[model samples]
Target: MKKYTCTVCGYIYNPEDGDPDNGVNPGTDFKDIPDDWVCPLCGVGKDQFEEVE
Candidate 1:
């Protein structure tokens, strides 16, 4: 899975890390993340996220 970056706050959401602080398990892909899941750092929606590469 590729890493996603939060456009609003520059928070990089890495699949390997999977936002453990937010209950998202490791290895979860960006597409697999819950739609209700907001950016851990900025509290923004997933629509604000973009692929790192």
Candidate 2:
């Protein structure tokens, strides 16, 4: 599994399978973001996520 970070608020996206409290939950794929799901921090689209290495 890989990790992703929100460029707007620096929220780390973990894929374990639970709630992250920022609207983004675990097991959320980049391509699975619903059109209605907006980022809670910056209200940006799911395309703002950056992969963390």
Candidate 3:
């Protein structure tokens, strides 16, 4: 399972290690994320993220 990365904050989101601190489980994928999910590091919208790999 690949993932996305927040270009604004350089925060990487991987299903194997989702942002549990922000209600994202360790197995959640990018498409499975909540609509309001944002970059926990910079508080930016999902638009700030891109498939970095």
Clashes of each: 0, 0, 0
Residue lDDT tens for model 3, 11-41: 8888898889889989887888998988888
* Root mean square deviation (Cα) for candidate 1: 0.7
Candidate 3 colliding pairs: none
> lDDT of all predictions, in order shown?
0.92, 0.67, 0.87
Q: Candidates' TM-scores? A: 0.93, 0.58, 0.86
- Top model by lDDT, which number? 1
By TM-score, who's the top model here? 1
Report the Cα lDDT for candidate 1.
0.92
Off by over 4 Å in 1: none
Q: Please write out the lDDT profile of model 1 over residues 1-53, one tens digit for every residue.
A: 78999999999998988888788999999999999999988799999999988
Tell me which of candidates 1 and 2 scores higher on TM-score: 1
lDDT for model 2, please.
0.67
| Order of models, best TM-score first | 1, 3, 2
Q: How close is candidate 1 to the true structure, as a TM-score?
A: 0.93
